[PDB]
């Protein structure tokens, strides 16, 4: 049938949302007026990973705010900052070619891709029966995940999300990966495709419990950039456009403020 | 244009092989009912009949030497000769020169045997 | 290897994918 | 010996089946290939593309609306072509106002974007085909950083493409369908193209006989 008991199993497994760590030696928080206009060579050196949690301002996202693709070109990544490592970036459908060309003009070669397949929660709720806040959406998602054996007879193509786009309806959100060669990678442990039940208002803004999935993917892809206490005197992972509340241990959080 | 039957006929006449299109522009469905490179053309049938009238049933080594069909499958040669003669047992019809068959008509009208598949049975 | 000759689906002409040469294999094996 | 007798009996049986099949074909037995399809057998390098263009002008009066390519990349196939030879194709002449559908592998994602740019197209979309199993689960795969479970169809566009014969905001950019024979694209791509361009002129390059459809001009070595 749907097999949604297996396509949504990660949302009931041993993946909880991780509690933030206060300002100590395990995490470092930097407040900058603009990363795209500032020199990052001093905040961290020899970065083994660089995740750019970029929300893009495109025509697809209507009446929203976000970064601009033309502003990524003048982002200096010095060699001392970044010798060997992978750069992670969220991609829309309008700017994939611009992203890949801009990253090629800096020294990074496209290596991979990662997409999220979106199932609507309204469709799942309606199949189960026969402005929302984040806690309300969380409890609705918990309700959907509980009654996961009533909508098992439904056709999965009838539950997919179909958002408006000029050419084909939007059903996925993709993360591009680029690599610079001057890493002790762990290779095949996460699939390119993950299934998520999401609210339809703005699926680009990935929420917790799925951002945790991305963090776990990145941190199992790079098992030697972890900050072991005492052993390492500097952090090795940097995440730009961080959340001001959750400071992940072992990372450098850069928040625009 | 708003006529895909006639448009397909004309395009197949001008840009497709003679083994893929008919004279009027229709698909040669026999070509697509067989694997590529194994289609028996009417030219092959004419060459087979010409070789039969030239040399007879006999052995098929000579017909594969002078290459009337372009180095075709010899098994198809001693299979499609049975269709014209009407008997799946041509052992007694060995080495006979025939121009007009005169045998298919008489050997396809035997009611004692089974006239199945437009052919008499051994 | 007698049954494997026809397990795969072929075209009508190809179904004798080795009976083509088995036609002479039988003759040679009857010769000696 | 007994094996000779069994072989002779099997020969007689398959001979009878053979004879019945060609009798049926001579009667007028139709084929799985649809009518109204225009198959062309040639090599694309040796092809006289001017003749094809002139025929398309003579009959249809205008060039193709959707072009689909599944290029033979130098990744392993057994009939590959160089990237410059594929770039040397006169794709700029076969189309002026319409879409192009190029199936790109991960190793050839960047060069596919580059060729689509060089041919005069703008990369605007991309359809992901997620492979399903018979049970309905995700089919796994192999990669270097991650496991591959999808294939990419990069979609460029050039010229006036909204002129009353292309449809916007039609179908999902995800195909969740079972894996058919090797290297065979899902059948729903043709339905999506029908939703995109109803009853138009389509050209597909590097075609096989299983890709033959109504209204589709197809070019290939085996087709
Ligand atoms: C990599 S494509 C995949 C086949 C097809 N796209 C499908 O979905 O089944 C392989 C086909 O390309 C065709 N091909 C290879 N070289 C060609 C050439 N130089 N010109 C035209 N077709 C070619 C061959 O006929 C082969 O069947």
> Residue A253: in which H helix or E strand, if any?
strand A252-256
- The Cβ-side half-sphere exposure at A58, using a 13 Å CA radius, reads 19
Gap from B3 CA to chain C (nearest CA, Å): 33
Strand partners, D152: D104, D128
User: Among residues B80, B87, B90, B94, which one has the least CA distance to residue B121?
Assistant: B87
Do residues A108 and A188 touch, judged by C-beta distance below 8 A? Answer: no
Whole-angstrom distance, CA of residue D57 vs CA of residue A224: 62
User: Among residues B5, A14, A73, C1, which one has the least CA distance to residue D34?
Assistant: B5
Chain A and chain D share a number of CB contacts under 8 A equal to: 111
Whole-angstrom distance, CA of residue A18 vs CA of residue D118: 47
Helix, coil or strand: residue A120: strand
Binding annotation of D for S-adenosyl-L-methionine: 43-44, 185, 208, 210-211, 221-222
Whole-angstrom distance, CA of residue D102 vs CA of residue A19: 45
Residues contacting B16, CB < 8 A, separation 6+: D38, D39, D40, D41
Atom 12, ligand 1: residue with shortest CA distance: D206
Do residues D143 and A109 touch, judged by C-beta distance below 8 A? Answer: no
Do residues A207 and A213 touch, judged by C-beta distance below 8 A? Answer: no
Whole-angstrom distance, CA of residue B47 vs CA of residue B49: 5
Gap from C28 CA to chain B (nearest CA, Å): 17
Buried b (16+ CB within 10 A) or exposed e, D180-210: eeeeebbebbbebbbebbeebbbbbbbbbee
Say what angle helices D2-27 and C19-31 make with each other, to 10 degrees: 150
Unique residue bearing structure tokens 């597909």:
D204
Ligand 1 centroid to residue C32 C-alpha, Å = 47
Say if the Cβ atoms of D4 and C29 lie within 8 Å.
Answer: yes
Residues contacting B23, CB < 8 A, separation 6+: none
C-alpha pair distances (Å), D131 with each of B21, D134, D150, D152: 37, 10, 6, 12
List the Cα angle A55/A56/A59 in 5-degree steps. 135
Residues contacting B122, CB < 8 A, separation 6+: B87, B88, B89, D12
Residues contacting D118, CB < 8 A, separation 6+: D87
Nearest 5°: phi and psi at B21? -120, 150
Residues contacting B18, CB < 8 A, separation 6+: none
Do residues A235 and A250 touch, judged by C-beta distance below 8 A? Answer: yes
| Bridge-based pairing state of the strands D216-220 and D150-158 | unpaired
Say what angle helices D2-27 and B74-85 make with each other, to 10 degrees: 70
Residues contacting D114, CB < 8 A, separation 6+: none
With contacts defined as CB-CB under 8 Å, which chain D residues touch C18?
none
Nearest 5°: phi and psi at B50? -65, -40
Residue A146, classified by CB atoms within 10 Å of its CB into exposed (0-12), middle (13-18) or buried (19+), is exposed
Say if the Cβ atoms of B33 and D31 lie within 8 Å.
Answer: yes
Partner residue opposite D36 with nearest CB, options B5, B33, B122: B5
Token reading at B50? 């010409």
Token reading at C32? 């000696």
Can you give the resolution of this entry in Å? 2.6
Whole-angstrom distance, CA of residue D85 vs CA of residue B72: 34
Residue A42, classified by CB atoms within 10 Å of its CB into exposed (0-12), middle (13-18) or buried (19+), is exposed
User: Among residues D105, D114, D47, which one has the least CA distance to residue D84?
Assistant: D114
- Pocket of ligand 1, candidates D70, D79, D185: which has the most ligand atoms within 8 Å of its Cβ, to mutate? D79
> Residue B113: in which H helix or E strand, if any?
none
Whole-angstrom distance, CA of residue D198 vs CA of residue A194: 33
Token reading at B88? 């799946």
> Residue A10: in which H helix or E strand, if any?
none
Do residues D20 and B115 touch, judged by C-beta distance below 8 A? Answer: no
With contacts defined as CB-CB under 8 Å, which chain B residues touch C23?
75
Q: Residues, chain C, total?
A: 32
User: Among residues A167, A177, A169, which one has the least CA distance to residue A86?
Assistant: A177
Unique residue bearing structure tokens 């403020």:
A257
Nearest 5°: phi and psi at D124? -120, -15
Q: Residues, chain B, total?
A: 122
Say what angle helices B74-85 and B42-55 make with each other, to 10 degrees: 80
List the alpha helices (DSSP H) in A206-253.
211-221
List the Cα angle A51/A55/A61 in 5-degree steps. 155
Please give the span between the terminal C-alpha atoms of chain C, in angstroms, as a whole number. Answer: 21
Whole-angstrom distance, CA of residue D208 vs CA of residue D90: 21
**What does A62-108 look like in DSSP terms, one character per residue?**
TT---B-GGGGTT----TTT-SSEEEEEEE-SSSHHHHHHHHHTTT-
Range 5-24 of C in CB contact (< 8 A) with D: 6, 12-13, 15-16, 19, 22-23
Token reading at A218? 């990145």
> Residue A37: in which H helix or E strand, if any?
none
Ligand 1 centroid to residue D141 C-alpha, Å = 23
Handedness of CA B88, B94, B95, B98 (dihedral sign): negative
- The Cβ-side half-sphere exposure at D143, using a 13 Å CA radius, reads 25
3-state secondary structure labels for all residues of chain D: CHHHHHHHHHHHHHHHHHHHHHHHHHHCCCCCCCCCCEEEECCCCCCCHHHHHHHHHHHCCCCCCEEEECCCCCCCCCCCCCHHHHHCCCHHHHCCCEEEEEEECHHHHHHHHHHHHHCCCEEEEEEEEEEECCCCCECCCCCCCCECCEEEEEEEEECCCCCCCCCCCCCECEEEEECCCCCCCCCHHHHHHHHHCCCCCEEEECCCHHHCCCCEEEEECCC
The DSSP call for residue A128 is H
Handedness of CA A103, A104, A109, A115 (dihedral sign): positive
Residue B12, classified by CB atoms within 10 Å of its CB into exposed (0-12), middle (13-18) or buried (19+), is buried
Q: Residues, chain A, total?
A: 257
Whole-angstrom distance, CA of residue A145 vs CA of residue A11: 8
Do residues A234 and A16 touch, judged by C-beta distance below 8 A? Answer: no
Whole-angstrom distance, CA of residue B55 vs CA of residue B68: 13
User: Among residues D211, D168, D212, D216, which one has the least CA distance to residue D192?
Assistant: D168
Say if the Cβ atoms of A110 and D110 lie within 8 Å.
Answer: yes
Interface of chain A toward chain D, CB-CB under 8 angstroms = 1-3, 6-7, 93-94, 96-97, 100, 104, 109-115, 117, 156-157, 160, 162, 164-172, 177, 185, 187-193, 221
Helix, coil or strand: residue B87: strand
List the Cα angle D10/D16/D17 in 5-degree steps. 90
| Bridge-based pairing state of the strands A237-240 and D122-132 | unpaired
Helix, coil or strand: residue A132: coil
User: Among residues A164, A157, A150, A145, which one has the least CA distance to residue A119?
Assistant: A157
Do residues A152 and A2 touch, judged by C-beta distance below 8 A? Answer: yes
Helix, coil or strand: residue A252: strand
The DSSP call for residue B45 is H
In A211-251, the DSSP E strands lie at 237-240
List the Cα angle D192/D132/D193 in 5-degree steps. 10
| Bridge-based pairing state of the strands D174-178 and D202-205 | unpaired
Whole-angstrom distance, CA of residue D10 vs CA of residue B58: 24
Do residues A26 and A251 touch, judged by C-beta distance below 8 A? Answer: no
Report how many helices (DSSP H) and strands (DSSP E) chain A contains, helices first.
5, 8
Whole-angstrom distance, CA of residue A126 vs CA of residue D25: 53
Nearest 5°: phi and psi at C28? -70, -35
Give CA D178 to chain center in angstroms: 17
In B1-122, the DSSP E strands lie at none
Token reading at C4? 């494997």
Say if the Cβ atoms of D25 and B30 lie within 8 Å.
Answer: yes
Which chains share 3+ C-beta pairs under 8 angstroms with B? C, D
Whole-angstrom distance, CA of residue B17 vs CA of residue B39: 12
Do residues D195 and D180 touch, judged by C-beta distance below 8 A? Answer: no
Radius of gyration of chain D measured on its C-alpha atoms: 21
Whole-angstrom distance, CA of residue A21 vs CA of residue B50: 93
Unique residue bearing structure tokens 């020199």:
A39
C-alpha pair distances (Å), D52 with each of A195, B104, D40, D223: 45, 45, 10, 16
C-alpha pair distances (Å), A179 with each of A77, A95, A215, A224, D87: 13, 19, 18, 16, 26
CB count, 10 Å around CB of D72? 17
Residue of C nearest to D24 (CA): C12
């Amino acid at each position: 049938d749907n097999q949604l008991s297996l396509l949504l199993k990660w949302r009931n497994d041993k993946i909880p949302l991780k509690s933030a760590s206060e300002t100590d030696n395990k995490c470092k928080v930097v407040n900058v007026k603009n990363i795209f206009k500032s020199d990052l060579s001093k905040y961290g050196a020899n970065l083994q990973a660089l995740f750019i949690n970029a929300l893009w301002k495109v025509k697809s996202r209507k009446e929203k705010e976000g970064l601009n693709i033309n502003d990524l070109s003048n982002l200096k990544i010095p060699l001392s900052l970044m010798k060997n490592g992978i750069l992670f970036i969220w991609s829309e459908k309008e700017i994939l070619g611009q992203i890949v060309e801009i990253m090629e003009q800096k020294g990074f070669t496209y290596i991979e891709n990662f997409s999220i397949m979106f199932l609507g929660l309204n469709k799942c709720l309606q199949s189960i029966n026969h402005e929302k806040s984040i806690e309300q959406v969380t409890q609705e998602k918990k309700f959907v995940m509980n009654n996961l054996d009533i909508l098992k007879s439904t056709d999965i193509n009838n539950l997919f999300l179909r958002n408006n786009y000029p050419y084909f309806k939007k059903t996925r959100h993709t993360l591009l990966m680029f690599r610079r060669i001057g890493l002790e990678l762990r290779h095949q442990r996460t699939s390119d495709v993950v299934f998520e039940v999401t609210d339809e208002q703005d699926p680009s803004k990935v929420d917790t419990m799925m951002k945790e999935y991305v963090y776990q993917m990145i941190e199992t892809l790079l098992p030697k950039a972890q900050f072991i206490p005492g052993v390492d005197k500097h952090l090795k992972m940097m995440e730009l456009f961080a959340s001001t509340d959750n400071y992940r241990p072992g990372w450098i959080s850069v928040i625009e403020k | 244009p708003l006529d895909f039957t006639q448009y397909a006929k004309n395009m197949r006449k001008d840009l497709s092989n003679q083994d893929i299109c008919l004279e009027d522009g229709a698909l040669n469905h026999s070509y697509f009912l067989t694997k590529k490179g194994q289609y028996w053309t009417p030219l092959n049938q004419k060459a087979l009949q010409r070789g039969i009238e030239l040399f007879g049933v006999g052995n098929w080594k000579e017909i594969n030497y002078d290459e009337f069909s372009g180095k075709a499958n010899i098994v198809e040669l001693e299979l499609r000769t049975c269709m014209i003669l009407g008997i799946n047992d041509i052992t007694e019809y060995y080495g006979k020169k025939i121009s007009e068959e005169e045998q298919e008509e008489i050997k396809k009208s035997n009611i004692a045997k089974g006239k199945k598949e437009n052919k008499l049975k051994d | 290897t007698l049954e494997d000759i026809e397990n795969e689906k072929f075209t009508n002409l190809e179904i004798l994918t080795h009976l083509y040469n088995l036609k002479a294999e039988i003759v040679r094996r009857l010769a000696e | 010996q007994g094996l000779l007798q069994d072989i002779e009996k099997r020969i007689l049986h398959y001979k009878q089946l053979f004879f019945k099949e060609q009798n049926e074909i001579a009667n007028g037995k139709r084929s799985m290939v649809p009518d109204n399809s225009i198959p062309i057998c040639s090599d694309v390098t040796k092809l006289n593309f001017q003749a094809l263009i002139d025929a398309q002008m003579r009959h249809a009066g205008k060039m193709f609306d959707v072009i689909m390519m599944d290029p033979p990349w130098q990744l392993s196939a057994y009939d590959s072509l160089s990237d410059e030879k594929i770039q040397n194709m006169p794709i700029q002449s076969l189309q002026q106002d319409g879409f192009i559908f190029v199936w790109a592998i991960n190793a050839k994602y960047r060069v596919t974007i580059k060729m689509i740019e060089n041919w005069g197209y703008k990369l605007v979309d991309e359809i992901t085909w997620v492979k399903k199993t018979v049970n309905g689960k995700i089919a796994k795969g192999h990669g270097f950083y991650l496991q591959h479970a999808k294939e990419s169809c990069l979609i460029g566009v050039k010229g006036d493409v909204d002129n009353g014969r292309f449809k916007k905001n039609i179908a999902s950019d995800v195909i969740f369908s079972e894996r058919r024979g090797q290297s065979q694209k899902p059948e729903e791509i043709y339905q999506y193209i029908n939703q995109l361009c109803p009853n138009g002129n389509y050209l597909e390059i590097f075609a096989r006989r299983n890709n033959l459809h109504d209204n589709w001009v197809s070019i290939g070595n085996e087709l």
